[PDB]
Amino acid sequence: NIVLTQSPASLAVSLGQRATISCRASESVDSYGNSFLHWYQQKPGQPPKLLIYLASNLESGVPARFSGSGSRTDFTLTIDPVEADDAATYYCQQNNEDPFTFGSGTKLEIKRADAAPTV
Amino acid sequence: SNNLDSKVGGNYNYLYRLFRKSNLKPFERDISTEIYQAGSTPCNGVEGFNCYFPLQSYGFQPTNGVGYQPYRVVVLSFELLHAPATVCGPKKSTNLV
């Protein structure tokens, strides 16, 4: 049981900024040609979707703001620029070692423009 | 060959070898044609739960660029022996003198 300490826990960001989502892990490395993990986006009122698998291959359905890199053990998810679709929790999936544990989660909030309620 | 070999999701069946222990002879085929796994249990197709190929794979996607799509390359080799020539072409069309 590897507790993937994901930092930060919760942070409200605004539009046009750069959020730093770090995933701490140790296992594993060198699957077939790389040593990266999977990234996801879990919304509290919507089923999640896969952003990018193995951090080196193309996949449709993801916005272009999700990118980044990382080392063999630690990884970093960079959201730049922050749009108004980041009100969700992000995790990292261990894909090589049993049990396939996950991160702690970074609950990001959107500081968008002001809006009036419906009357 | 994007409409012939590639499919939805990417075709990762074509790979290449980084380094070979033995030396290669001219007109010799590699007998190691079986796709091995990372462990002991074979996967028989797609990868998962530590059955990866140690050889490096190519990126063959249907939405890829024109310089990265799978291209079927056929090398037309030529040789000459003590036997007379048999294969020749083309020679158009129907002349006689």
């Binding site: 999977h38 996801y40 509290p44 089923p47 999640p48 979707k49 896969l50 698998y53 193995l54 291959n57 999936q93 894909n95 090589n96 | 999701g9 990417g10 990762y12 797609v46 990868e47 998962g48 739960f49």
Partner: peptide, 18 residues
């Protein structure tokens, strides 16, 4: 919590979702 189900993908990931 709100549980979800997913199928295994090609590169050992959760590609399919409901």
């Amino acid at each position: 919590a709100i549980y979800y189900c997913a199928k295994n993908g090609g590169a050992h990931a959760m590609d399919f979702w409901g």
